[PDB]
């Protein structure tokens, strides 16, 4: 209907709870493996944030896998930073991690993050 | 870290995608039964929005069930309105549904919705 009212903080409060479930390992259904570092997560959150995971988990065969191995060139710290961003909206971008974060966001197909990384790099040149 | 940047629209864009997955029946893992009306959903979203579902899906036995039957006194339309609110932040509150929505939100333990229903009722008295 066109007559709905909207609760402003609802989406952020939902994301905060999904991150609390992740921290407590509640209903996590996939392990992402990045160069032997393992990260537990919810498939739905990964699909909701990344073009790569959206493609993987809508595939008839890959949707059922409980372990996904990323390309060996992917940096585990860059992945960890992006996984935290998916569950919090906050991106820990620093001079010492920006190149790894941008390369990881390109691989993961997270366009807004890639944009932002490009702008921070361009400002330093 | 204390040096994070924040993407304002991220949480709302995540919720929009979780609702698109629900509409396409992608990775839904539970059916909620309300007086023979069935609603498919994601356990994590229900837990993130409702005190009742948070209690149900953190129980060692109930966490594994694929079907949950609600109390027969619960109105299916009231439940449908609240399930839409969980996935969109928008509540379709109308004179003809407010009593059923408030009773359902009380049962589901959604305090902000109950508050709001009380204020709209009080204004009409």
């Amino acid at each position: 209907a066109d007559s709905c009212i909207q609760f402003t903080r609802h989406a952020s409060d939902v994301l905060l709870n999904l991150n609390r479930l992740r921290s407590r390992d509640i209903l996590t259904d996939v392990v992402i493996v990045v160069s032997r570092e393992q990260f537990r997560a919810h498939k739905t959150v990964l699909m909701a944030c990344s073009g790569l995971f959206y493609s993987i988990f809508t595939d008839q065969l890959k949707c059922n896998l409980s372990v996904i191995n990323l390309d060996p060139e992917i940096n585990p710290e860059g992945f960890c930073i992006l996984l935290d961003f998916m569950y919090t909206s906050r991106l820990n971008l620093r001079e010492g991690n920006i190149m790894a974060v941008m390369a990881t966001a390109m691989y993961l197909q997270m366009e807004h993050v890639v944009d932002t990384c490009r702008k921070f790099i361009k400002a330093s040149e | 870290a204390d040096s994070c940047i924040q993407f304002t629209r991220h949480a709302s864009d995540v919720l929009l995608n979780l609702n698109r997955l629900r509409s396409r029946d992608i990775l839904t893992d539970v059916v909620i039964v309300v007086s023979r009306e069935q609603f498919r959903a994601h356990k994590t979203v229900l837990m993130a929005c409702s005190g009742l579902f948070y209690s149900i899906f953190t129980d060692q036995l109930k966490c594994n069930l694929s079907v949950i039957n609600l109390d027969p006194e619960i109105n299916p339309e009231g439940f449908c309105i609240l399930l839409d609110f969980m996935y969109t932040s928008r509540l379709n509150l109308r004179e003809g549904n407010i009593m059923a929505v408030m009773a359902t939100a009380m049962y589901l333990q959604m305090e902000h919705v109950v508050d709001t229903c009380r204020k709209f009722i009080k204004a009409s008295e």
Binding site: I5, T8 | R90, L91, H112
Partner: peptide
């Protein structure tokens, strides 16, 4: 909170 969207 609540607003008219």
């Amino acid at each position: 909170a609540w607003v008219i969207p």
